[PDB]
Design a binder for this molecule. Sequence first.
Ligand code: 7ER
Ligand code: 7ER
Lengths: 9, 10, 236, 233
Amino acid sequence: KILHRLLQD
Amino acid sequence: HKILHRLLQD
Amino acid sequence: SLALSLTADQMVSALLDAEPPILYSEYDPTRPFSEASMMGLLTNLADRELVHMINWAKRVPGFVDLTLHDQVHLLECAWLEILMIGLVWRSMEHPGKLLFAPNLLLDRNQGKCVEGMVEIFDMLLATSSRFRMMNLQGEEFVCLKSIILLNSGVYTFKSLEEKDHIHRVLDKITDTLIHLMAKAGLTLQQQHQRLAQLLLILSHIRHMSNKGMEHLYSMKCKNLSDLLLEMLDAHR
Amino acid sequence: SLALSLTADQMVSALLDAEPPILYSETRPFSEASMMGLLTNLADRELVHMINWAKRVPGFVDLTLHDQVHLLECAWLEILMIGLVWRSMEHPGKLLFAPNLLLDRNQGKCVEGMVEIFDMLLATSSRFRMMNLQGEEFVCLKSIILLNSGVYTEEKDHIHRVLDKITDTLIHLMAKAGLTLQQQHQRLAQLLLILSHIRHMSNKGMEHLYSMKCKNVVPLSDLLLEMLDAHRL
Ligand SMILES: O=S1(=O)C=C(c2ccc(O)cc2F)C(c2ccc(O)cc2F)=C1
Ligand SMILES: O=S1(=O)C=C(c2ccc(O)cc2F)C(c2ccc(O)cc2F)=C1
């Protein structure tokens, strides 16, 4: 779920 | 001469 | 030239009087349907609607002033968009249902009869709920439908002075939409906001047409009328 | 919420300041695999900046995590394309993917099916040129694509109010340029109708990338595969 991780940062 | 090509004329 | 010399009210009455009729389906409810039958109903219906749409396009102000090659091109790119915005418009007073014909009213569970059809059904339903929320007016609808006809194929084209004429007609339809919103009592800010909301819906109608175009192209290569295959091979 | 209590000039500067940087591509004549690789690598790195640009779009951070994911999954290729079209404005007949990667439509023939998408992108750039699209209008259009493209697939009432806010910002920009009332809503309509073609280009581009994922000609990145798999379920 790469997109989720990139939105957290 | 396609179908649409003819219906646009008639 | 006469299309440019049209007042906004004469633009509306011309579009309103040019409206195609609501056709009926061959739908016999003695049958619960197979996939081929429900597809046959939608295919036969869309084929007869295309004939009326072709004659409707000839009454759109400015469309007749175009060469025959350009008329064919605009209709080939926009035919499904025009069928869909009409279906969505007919379905405004039937929440959660798509009124393909007065005798063919379908909800999303019946759309699951065809594989992959349910996804396009929900998009069509969401568009109809959007028109319901905005309280879309028939005067606004006929303007939007003619915008689709003139816009969807204008950037898929020396001499190119015809594209300048299309943009002049498109600007006139824009003036007509503002003229309608100004008559309904909307403020200048409200007119510009509603104008933007209506035109952003055309982006989603383009999206549904692209998805529906792939869905039909799959049905052709998986076992349609000759006019419809001729339109379907325009996307290829 | 704070995006609503904000002025038109503050909307423009916020969008301008959030603009992503222009990235570079990594000389040898092009082939099917080499050109697809450069475009895949460039798009994968642009996506990382787009995600941080989206969080700086006013009103986007007010959305839930799932709604942010949905909007970006639906609009990512549209956003890449309108940025590419914007970069290529001052280069008629060419597409500026990167400052060191300026391509014409003859070079688009190095990949099958790439020509049709190239011609559409070049047509949109010439349309922006003919309309003399300003950067203030461009950042408004790009943020509209982000919020609108996935809005039909209340948290939606917020997105629609933010969308109305950008419409007010576009009109405010045109009134500052000296355009009349008729010229304002006409230009507003002309700009928004282009978004329908940008959506069409994205759908055609989405089909093309799915073919290359199946043809297995160039390995796509995991993020790029996740964005691509979102357009089927
Ligand atoms: O997306 S759909 O479920 C909706 C339609 C459709 C049919 C008739 C119509 O007036 C409007 C439509 F959208 C169609 C459609 C279905 C079959 C066909 O041959 C042509 C079509 F357009 C599929
Ligand atoms: O339709 S395309 O010719 C244009 C692009 C594209 C790539 C990067 C970019 O910043 C904008 C684009 F449009 C792409 C594209 C091509 C390959 C890829 O892996 C991702 C992409 F987006 C294909």
